[PDB]
């Protein structure tokens, strides 16, 4: 993930043009081998076309340039594009607001599960384990990056995120599908025990702790669905043969051609076709987005940080249902104990940002006396 | 479902050129037929207008062809098929996200639903069969493949989805109506029994457990409205007359025109319409992918796998209420027990991914002494 | 309602050709009228110019055309029609996703509402037939089909919607209102003093059903909105002008002058305006989609069977909550009761369905020994 | 708020074109003044032109107006407008959305609060009294007409909607903010009081009281929220400047020159500028309806009913929970009371509204008896 | 943020015209000064052009001029702004709202957190400001304003939002990591200890005031994740390329010719390009809207008052928590106790705003007596 919200925060003048000078997650770094091989490509032919071609192939070719140059606009690549971007950026969102945080459910745990005592910590860290367990297996099973870290159960083991019992546990009901599910059967069992056992004082507090877990669990059975159905392989290839044929045929037809012959586009000849490459720059970057962000659990630079995600969760989490459990900052009157309107100070830095209280569009509208009379 | 999830993981060069590859729900398996036909008329009428007309005829043709040019465009047919694709397309996630996983039901099962003797094994796994058989219900209604697997109710008894005596049941309970809504009724009376007798401790596991069953019947409903209520038929029928008069309209103004007769755009003669063949691909693949994800439960190659995720629904959800019900591996403390900050280890794949955690956009804010001053 | 789902179930060769040939809910029954009414204009306007103009007449005839013909593309038809049917097909989808199914409140009911004797077969009825006429009165306020059905209070009475006493009641408390909200207050009323008389055991079994009562009423609230606060008619009037005017622009302005002026384009006489009406079909088609689907309760073939719905509904609910209740299949074990991995039978016509799980898109990715190496 | 669904209900002849010869909310009624203006200065340079300017000024003048003309574009317009008017209807129908309905919370109260007597009258009417209340400080700060209505707290006390002493508490409470959120306050407070009293027998009712004020609280501040943060004023003077640079260019560029100068687009004309002027209908149009939506709860013709909403409310509010609470209508047997399957009738003018039930789109699916039989 | 709500409450005459005379958050504010570059350059261009280069280089400069024009689109530049420009406006409005408000939780902690001694206010005044100090947290991380009001711990102590011993728990748990989920911890442990020591008499209340702050945390954490995953650097970057070399070219391809050389369309020579500059503003404008909502918690003029937002919410939740809690105003008979249809009176400002209510669409629909009768 590359992130320059500090840099955006104000529209100041060049805001977006400061932005080019970013190599990491840039345009240039997504497509500087594409543009290399077109500008290979396009001098291969400008030199073929210069040299090798007699007079009547050079003809020949002039021809085809103008034909190409005056038929490309029959490719609505940017149609396409700007659909199928908008297509993948949404499912992009999605995949990232279906990403589980323990938070809620470890305040819950810590809150519900009772007992200071040895039996208490462990009963917590075991259900708060388990949440993350089947968070982390999930990852793994749609992240790259994840999978990389945690290659096997037995890695699993040795990050501590699986103890060697559970590992066995989940072999003895090993079934010819992805066992992510498995840890939340044995949340609510264990939930269900300490119930029973009197840690958990009362049955709306399993219900609430059960549907945290079951939010947990919709959101990694999304992020499941989404690794498994891609987007239609139908609807990329006709975005990329788009974008390819248009590129292709300007490779032909935004040749500079011979002076002499002086045709209208062509009387002035410069080496370099800056707007042919502006153009390439432009729709290449755009297909760029769609191909950077169709899988956001890979490894480019926008991808989201699963690996950071992982290791936050396991130490917010273990830290919340145990240090946390019934630790509180002592209770004392606060600095507003008698005071009927507190109002906070504001810095120096921050004065001119005291806004009066927003009372409604109506506030301001005047009227008569008799206006506002009541009627009967 | 045609998944290159791990292809398009990462932003590498040709990415997509590389997906272009692939022949399985594929733009060149959807539309060749399309194509051959296309082909075959517009060189029909290449040969008869350039062997078989007079002159008379001939000049009289390149006047239609040159009047014809001018009326194809290219905005209202990308609109309406952008329109429309959209639809479709966010119709396809909508069906794919009311498929019912019994995942979040069956867990509150087995945690609930008390008794490791046979009663209590036969309460859990027929609540869990009453899940599944009316998702099955609703499958076969609305999934070829799926009614293919169970074309009868008889199918389903054998199968093992329904007993003999639901299916005796049913036969009673027989309406001129889709009686997929039958196994909820039966799920929730069957449910409320099990409280009454003891085996549900509390009538607020019996209201999370109702509430996971009608967010299954919520989505099956989803389904079946899904199957009935088809995209406006006027809507699909103007799409595609907009498509097929675009090309009808091609396959005479797109003919190269004899040269001689120096027309102001039909200087070169080459024998294959590239651009037009090009246009043909982009367009009648834009429209394949309506086509295909109009219905979503066919069989096509991009189609939902109906069957597998039946098995797979059916499989995790007996092992999770009758084998997995207050089976837990044992609880031990972790690798992290007395650790307040754990660190899980990096392999040397991933040791690259190890970031520092994001703490805001407005921590790298400079500010001064006299600027961090509160005033009164 | 026309369901074409089981014909474009697959992507096949011609698949939406084969739809062209549909009548019912079809382009050519919506707008045969118009096309007939616009072709007696085009071809009265012909014979005028050709059997009515002196010569001089004939000449600035000849210039209107070439003006209408050219000025004629400033109509932001296809933009204006695309963006206004877009939000005419979502709320068309919203108005059918709050229309009230009274399939989860009726499990509810039958579930919870304890008493196989008269009493309670009688208080489960009346809330499941309290529930009805809701949504009964709801849908007689907003289609015109079951307004013509039960065109009033004494129709739902006579039709068993409801009863002489609750006519009655609904008279005594009448309103200058819409009263389709009264069986609300009445259902909750009943449920709580069911809940006083110990025929619903629980509270939080009460809450359950009057939350499902509650979803009803938003879901049928959401109707009379839709019924109520239209699309703006200066954004419909935006877009019926636009079409309008181009297409009586066209009747001028799509005319075969005569070929003696060699006018371009106006060399060749077709008699036939072939490509007029192509596009003449596209857009108002395109405008036809938004006609139909603006009111979707009315009596188009594409808008919802209102009607059917009463009668499921009312036989659907009236069945699970008397006949259903406590009324279970016995219980046995199942095909698979000591089968630790249940595999349900493929028929020959579905055998090729069989698929391999997906476990992930990372299941494939081969490391080195030293790469999934834990590092210190 | 202008209706004319019941004009739009089915697609006849001319649908949409019936529904131009409508004043009230209209395109005219709504752009008059601005065509006058535009009239005007349009007729104002076309007499100068043709009479003040000397022989070389119009020379001048018509090099201008080609060059102006070919300045005038449709596409930067038309998207810009699309956008922001597709914005500005989603705002508009959230907003609608957010309008809080208190029929949910007054079936609740209804059923919940027990007591026939003077006290639970009083307590019953209170909690609506409180709900309407806040729901009307909200509108009557949002609402342009609301306010009118009641543009003091005095106006509020003196139309019944605040007694003096709740107007006594505000005063004693007020901060300088919009305090509509007080009587969400004094809801709890007071439901708070009733269960400890016994007026409402449990948690859960209470619960589920709070949950409907709750929802309605959110409600009321979504619309508290769209009040105040408008839509952006750079975007709105985006899309102005738009629309008036395109029609201050249009003065001049459709300007008709002399037809002797046989300027290409120049040969005939017309003294009214047909096109410029529909051109000048449907954009100036499109933007009216940004501008009427923009601000839902202005006096507009198609604005909300604020008032009504108001009044209906309260009085339904208040009938439900004082004249409805335990007032049911006699519980007796129905028509359908042994009918197994019930069908209600269809009238002379409905019959054909009777469908056959839809039993999913496989229901007709083919298949050999070598087809179904199972595999092993 | 900029209110103009008043403003545009009806659609006027000039409504937003008069939108044009305002200089904050305008569009003049926003890009005066890439305006001033762009104009400095052109003119800068220019006068080389015209002045300094030779007769050949003049030539020379002529045909690239040519060149460069017909080197410019509108069609793609319109797409991707209009594209972005939505995705950004989602963004904003998602970002603003998930801004917490502690409305909910406030009154649900006022009604249930019982006691009027000083252990029960510092019971609810604790766990108000926990909500609020989280709130806060949040605010401070991805606001500039926010963060310059509270560089710092300390100063969250010093404004009385934190106390010392908060402070110094917070050091105590400090990870690597934003520690703004601890309040909710503290929130959840001290409604426990609540519940256990009887100031909250239910786990129905205990749940309901935990969903309240959890839906905060949840809000929180979209807040986070907004500041955090910006919209894709390669995307802003392909739209800034877009504009920046839409309007490079135009530097040279809208420079006026020498009107001498009587080129296709440069016979005029205005000085100034109006139209190059209006496209210019259109374009820049609808890029700079995007520029300032990309991060909506800067210091624009449209950016969020979080100040305010902060100030409001705590003056509001501890009045709400400590003197309204169990402080009603008098219950006494309102102005309607026996009136079974209130009417509140209008205002001679508002008595036009009466209306009739709103039956449904076919309350006007018209039958015959045959046609009204049941059929057997
Ligand atoms: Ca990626
Ligand atoms: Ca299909
Ligand atoms: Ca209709
Ligand atoms: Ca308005
Ligand atoms: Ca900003």
Not at 257 to 277: I, M, R, S, W
Request: include cysteine; aromatic fraction near 16%; charged fraction near 20%.
């Amino acid at each position: 993930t590359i992130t320059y919200t500090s840099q955006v925060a104000n529209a100041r003048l060049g805001s977006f043009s400061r932005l080019l000078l970013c190599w990491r997650g840039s345009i240039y770094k997504l497509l500087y081998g594409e543009f290399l091989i077109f500008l290979l490509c396009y001098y291969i032919i400008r030199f073929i076309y210069r040299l090798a071609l007699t007079e009547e192939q050079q003809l020949m070719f002039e021809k085809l340039t103008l034909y190409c140059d005056s038929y490309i606009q029959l490719i609505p690549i940017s149609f396409v594009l700007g659909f199928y971007v908008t297509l993948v950026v949404t499912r992009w969102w999605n995949q990232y607001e279906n990403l589980p945080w323990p938070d809620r459910l470890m305040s819950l745990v810590s809150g519900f599960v009772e007992g200071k005592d040895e039996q208490g910590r462990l009963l917590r860290r075991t259900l708060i384990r388990y949440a993350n367990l089947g968070n982390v297996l999930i990852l793994r099973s749609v992240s790259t990056a994840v999978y990389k870290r945690f290659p096997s159960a037995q890695h699993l083991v040795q990050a501590g995120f699986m103890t060697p019992a559970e590992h066995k546990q989940l072999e003895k009901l090993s079934l010819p599908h992805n066992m992510f599910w498995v840890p939340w059967v044995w949340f609510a069992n264990l939930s269900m025990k300490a119930w029973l056992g009197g840690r958990i004082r009362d049955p709306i507090l399993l219900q609430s702790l059960l549907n945290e877990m079951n939010t947990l669990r919709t959101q990694c059975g999304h992020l499941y669905a989404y690794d498994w159905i891609s987007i239609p392989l139908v609807y990329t290839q006709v975005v990329t043969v788009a974008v390819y044929s248009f590129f292709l045929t300007c490779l032909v037809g935004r040749q500079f051609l011979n002076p002499a012959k002086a045709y209208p586009g062509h009387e002035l000849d410069l080496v370099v076709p800056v707007f042919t490459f502006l153009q390439f720059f432009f729709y290449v970057g755009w297909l760029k987005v769609a191909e950077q962000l169709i899988n956001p659990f890979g490894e480019d630079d926008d991808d989201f940080e699963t690996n950071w995600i992982v290791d936050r969760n396991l130490q917010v989490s273990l830290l919340a249902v145990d240090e946390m459990h019934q630790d509180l900052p002592r209770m004392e009157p606060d600095m507003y104990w008698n005071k009927p309107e507190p109002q906070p100070p504001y810095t120096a830095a921050s004065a001119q940002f005291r806004r009066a209280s927003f009372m409604g569009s109506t506030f301001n509208i005047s009227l008569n006396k008799e206006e506002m009379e009541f009627q009967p």
